[PDB]
Curated annotation (Swiss-Prot):
This is Protease 2A. Cysteine protease that cleaves viral polyprotein and specific host proteins. It is responsible for the autocatalytic cleavage between the P1 and P2 regions, which is the first cleavage occurring in the polyprotein. Also cleaves the host translation initiation factor EIF4G1, in order to shut down the capped cellular mRNA translation. Inhibits the host nucleus-cytoplasm protein and RNA trafficking by cleaving host members of the nuclear pores. Counteracts stress granule formation probably by antagonizing its assembly or promoting its dissassembly. Disulfide bonds: none annotated. It comes from Coxsackievirus A16 (strain G-10). It catalyses: Selective cleavage of Tyr-|-Gly bond in the picornavirus polyprotein.
Length: 139
């Protein structure tokens, strides 16, 4: 689990979005595993606006943060789950590291701010859904 709170928005993994998230829907993209809902309180997370390929992510299954090198956002093939059939997930970044399903939502950060959230894993690779291109989260 995990979310990003920025301005009057809440960014979550689309597959973990709640009834409240869907009742206050702003934008969702199944191909990215992202959903943004509106909030009443003001969030103060800072979104990174950069091309960093190194950062640190929170891994709840180890209660630890790990430093990683990660690929630029791209279309990557992802195996089926109870939420999606096998498909290409877009805007995804991979790194070598540990993850388990419950780790989705963990934040990846660089020196500039939030980069994305854990969204996929398997075979010793962890994938992060990028949010740096969503310039509207700040306005
Ligand atoms: C962090 O996730 C994992 N890590 C290790 C093993 C397995 C996982 C689960 C995984 O990959 N998922 C979770 C359900 C949604 C799927 C998607 N985005 O298409 C991805
Ligand atoms: Zn950065």
């Amino acid at each position: 689990s995990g979310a990003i709170y920025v301005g009057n928005y809440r960014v979550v993994n689309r597959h973990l979005a709640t009834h409240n998230d869907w009742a206050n829907l702003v934008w969702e993209d199944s191909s990215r595993d992202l959903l943004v809902s509106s909030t009443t309180a003001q969030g103060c997370d800072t979104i990174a606006r950069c091309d960093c390929q190194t950062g640190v992510y929170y891994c709840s299954s180890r209660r630890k943060h790990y430093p990683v090198s990660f690929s630029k956002p791209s279309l990557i093939f992802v195996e089926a789950s109870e939420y999606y059939p096998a498909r290409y997930q877009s805007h995804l970044m991979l790194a070598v590291g540990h993850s388990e399903p419950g780790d989705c939502g963990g934040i990846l950060r660089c020196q500039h701010g939030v980069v994305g959230i854990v969204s996929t894993g398997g075979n010793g690779l962890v994938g992060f859904a990028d949010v740096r291109d969503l310039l509207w989260l700040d306005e």
